Design a protein around this ligand. Structure first.
Ligand SMILES: C[C@@H]1O[C@@H](O[C@@H]2[C@H](O)[C@@H](O)[C@@H](O[C@@H]3[C@H](O)[C@@H](O)[C@H](C)O[C@H]3O)O[C@@H]2C(=O)O)[C@H](O)[C@H](O)[C@H]1O
Ligand SMILES: [Ca+2]
Ligand SMILES: [Ca+2]
Length: 425
């Protein structure tokens, strides 16, 4: 079956093209494996009083849409912007403010799902202590899903937040202009674009493995663009752009941590040891771009082992590459050391911003550090690039959702010969 929804539809309708549904709550009542839902473009304001589809964590979370049904292998359930209509569906969550609860807009427990082509805006935070909300929260048991050309923006919530699940592909998604102005004095320190945090409950082959962020952009998230702390299976970030994170949206006002790619770690607590996986995962950041994050570009974040940083480009992102690891095995007090077991290869780094640096805190005897611009005999300069115009990075995606063509961060023909094989382009 192909069902339809529309902002001016009705949940008393049958869900046909002529008589569409109004909400995903009704969609969820009827769909089965192999069904397709075409979501007509327009603005869907979620009513303030719409009851949550579920709650989690002893009532802490109000979950707007519970993506609880599953497809089968070869027969997904697909929730797609209607490809026969121009424009995008935009779910506006600005009225949803349940007292004393965190918000999850799409709480994903099902498997074999395909979600494409729509936006989630205005997601709220009302709690004033330590808190967060998420546009997408994916957990243990949610396997073999695809999230494509989705945009989580102009709200107070983390865009994508993985606590578990396997083979979740987050492809060509944007998370931008996300800032929690409400909690903890409006620091914004828990709002990332994309978070990979496969927890202890979700470990194992086919249980927490295989999740990938690909082709995604994160900008003006108040904390980090991408963050893989406390992530018990390897997560990969491939062909992603992370820029202008750590600032309040549209400004250079200081907010949170400002990392482009925070690519590991299990914390640096002084009081107690963190839980850790049995095998420290080798997360990866490859063919990616960091530009003008407030503090750091590509960061090992006190990892307890090796990360792969391959074929990336950093421009004016503070510490463009920082390989700091925590000393292993775990001990107290916690100790930072030069990064060990990393692969740092074929990277490019430009510095013309005051206080920015190429690479810090790498152990070259324990990490493979090869063919990076910062270890060559010539400095990388601005005119080695075709363009460094920031606006290019915010250009509209192509109609199919692919990243826009840009010259930003692309070496000229002449420079490419002097920095051969280096950088994300
Ligand atoms: C619902 C809570 O879940 C757990 O706490 C998580 C997380 O395990 C903690 O490490 C910590 O994480 C913070 C941020 O909240 C998180 O977004 C970021 C990626 O890492 C740390 O900065 O708090 C989390 C949280 O959700 O509050 C624990 O099981 C808590 O007891 C539980 O309330
Ligand atoms: Ca933070
Ligand atoms: Ca973060």
């Amino acid at each position: 079956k192909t069902y339809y929804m529309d902002p001016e539809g009705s949940d008393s309708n049958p869900g046909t093209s002529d008589k569409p549904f109004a909400t995903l709550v009704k969609v969820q009542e009827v769909v089965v494996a192999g069904d397709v839902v075409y979501i007509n473009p327009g603005t869907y304001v979620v009513p303030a009083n719409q009851v949550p589809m579920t709650t989690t964590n002893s009532g802490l979370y109000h979950c707007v849409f519970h993506m609880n049904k599953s497809g089968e292998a070869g027969k997904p359930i697909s929730y797609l912007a209607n490809p026969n209509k121009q424009g995008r569906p935009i779910f506006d969550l600005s009225q949803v403010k349940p007292k004393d609860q965190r918000i999850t807009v799409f709480y994903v427990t099902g498997s074999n799902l395909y979600l494409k082509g729509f936006d989630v805006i205005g997601t709220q935070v009302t709690i004033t202590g330590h808190t967060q909300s998420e546009c997408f929260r994916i957990v243990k048991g949610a396997n073999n899903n695809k999230f494509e050309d989705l945009r989580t923006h102009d709200g107070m919530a983390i865009g994508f937040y993985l606590l578990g699940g396997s083979n979740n592909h987050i492809l060509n998604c944007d998370a931008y202009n996300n800032y929690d102005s409400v909690s903890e004095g409006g620091k914004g320190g828990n709002v990332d674009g994309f978070g990979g945090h496969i927890n202890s409950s979700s470990v194992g082959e086919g249980k927490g493995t295989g999740n990938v962020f690909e082709g995604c952009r994160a900008w003006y998230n108040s904390d980090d663009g991408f963050d893989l702390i406390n992530c018990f299976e390897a997560v990969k970030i491939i062909n992603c752009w992370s820029f202008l994170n750590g600032y309040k949206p549209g400004t250079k006002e200081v907010a949170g941590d400002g990392t482009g790619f925070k690519a590991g770690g299990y914390g640096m607590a002084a009081d107690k040891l963190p839980a850790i996986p049995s095998v420290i995962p080798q997360h990866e950041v490859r063919n990616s771009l960091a530009y003008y994050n407030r503090l750091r570009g590509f960061y090992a974040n006190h990892h307890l082992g090796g990360i792969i940083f391959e074929s990336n480009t950093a421009v004016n992102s503070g510490e463009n590459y920082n390989m700091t690891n925590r000393e292993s095995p775990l001990a107290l007090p916690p100790t930072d050391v030069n990064g060990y077991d990393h692969m740092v290869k074929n990277n490019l780094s430009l510095v013309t911003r005051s206080g920015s640096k190429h690479i810090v805190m790498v152990n070259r005897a324990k990490s493979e550090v090869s063919n990076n611009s910062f270890d060559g005999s010539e400095e990388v300069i601005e005119t080695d690039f075709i363009s460094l115009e920031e606006a290019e990075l915010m250009r509209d995606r192509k109609p199919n959702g692919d990243l826009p063509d840009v010259n930003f961060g692309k070496l000229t023909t002449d420079a490419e010969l002097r920095f051969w094989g280096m950088g994300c382009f």
